[PDB]
C-alpha cells in the first residue's frame, strides 16, 4: 500500500517496481502545484523511518540541548534519555521519535534494530515585535519557531552507550520491608 514509485532509485539493487505516471490533472493551478511537491517528497526516505515536525515554539539553541544527547544512539536508549530530561523541548523530541518509529513499521522495518542516524533543525517563520526601553529607545521582541527532522535506519553505526535501570519505589501490597527480622543484628 506504499505510494507509487515513478523512477529508479540510486541503490545498487532495485527493490521496487516503477509505475506509470498519472495522465489526469487537478482542477486548479494552486492544487496542481501543491500536489507536484507532495509527489516529489514521496520518492525519498524509502526503507527508513522519517518524521518532520513543523512550527515548534522553541529556538535552535534550546532544541540542541536535547538533540545532542540522542545522536547515534539505539532507539531504545535514545527514547529513555528524552523522557528523563526536565525540559520543555524534550517533550517535542519524544513525540518525533514515536512518530518516526510508527512510520518505519508501516514500511516494514524491525523496531528492535533502529538507530538514530540523522537529526537536525531548520528555521521557521518568526513573530516580530518591539519593547520600549529607557529614554525613548526601543528594542526587539521576537518569538522563534523551528522544524525538527529525525531519520531512523536499520543496522547503522551506533554508539555503545547503555544506561543502568533500577526499579522505582515499591508502594502498596508489593512492599514487604515490614517483614524484616531485626533480631539477628544483636548477635556476634
Amino acid at each position: 500500500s506504499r505510494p507509487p514509485l515513478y523512477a529508479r532509485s540510486g541503490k545498487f539493487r532495485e527493490s521496487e517496481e516503477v509505475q506509470p505516471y498519472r495522465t489526469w490533472y487537478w482542477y486548479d493551478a494552486e492544487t496542481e502545484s501543491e500536489e507536484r511537491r507532495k509527489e516529489l517528497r514521496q520518492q525519498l526516505y524509502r526503507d527508513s523511518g522519517m518524521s518532520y515536525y513543523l512550527n515548534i515554539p522553541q529556538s535552535m539553541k534550546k532544541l540542541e540541548r536535547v538533540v545532542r544527547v540522542i545522536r547515534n544512539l539505539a532507539y531504545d536508549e535514545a527514547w529513555k534519555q528524552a523522557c528523563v530530561l526536565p525540559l520543555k523541548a524534550a517533550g517535542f523530541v519524544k513525540e518525533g521519535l514515536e512518530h518516526a518509529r510508527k512510520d518505519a513499521e508501516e514500511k516494514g522495518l524491525d523496531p528492535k534494530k533502529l538507530v538514530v542516524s540523522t537529526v537536525y533543525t531548520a528555521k521557521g517563520k518568526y513573530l516580530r515585535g518591539f519593547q520600549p526601553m529607557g529614554k525613548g529607545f526601543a528594542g526587539r521582541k521576537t518569538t522563534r519557531k523551528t522544524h525538527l527532522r529525525i531519520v531512523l535506519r536499520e543496522n547503522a553505526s551506533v554508539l555503545p552507550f547503555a544506561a543502568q535501570v533500577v526499579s522505582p519505589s515499591r508502594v502498596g501490597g508489593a512492599s514487604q520491608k515490614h517483614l524484616r527480622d531485626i533480631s539477628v543484628r544483636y548477635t556476634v
Binding site: 518524521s51 518532520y52 515536525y53 513543523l54 512550527n55 515548534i56 515554539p57 517535542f92
Partner: peptide
C-alpha cells in the same frame, strides 16, 4: 483581559493555524 469582541473570530483562526503539526 480586554480583547475586542469585533475580532474574536480572527483570534480563533490564528490560534488554530499556529499549532505544531507533522508534514503529510
Amino acid at each position: 483581559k480586554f480583547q475586542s469582541r469585533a475580532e474574536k473570530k480572527y483570534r480563533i483562526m490564528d490560534e488554530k493555524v499556529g499549532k505544531p503539526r507533522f508534514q503529510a
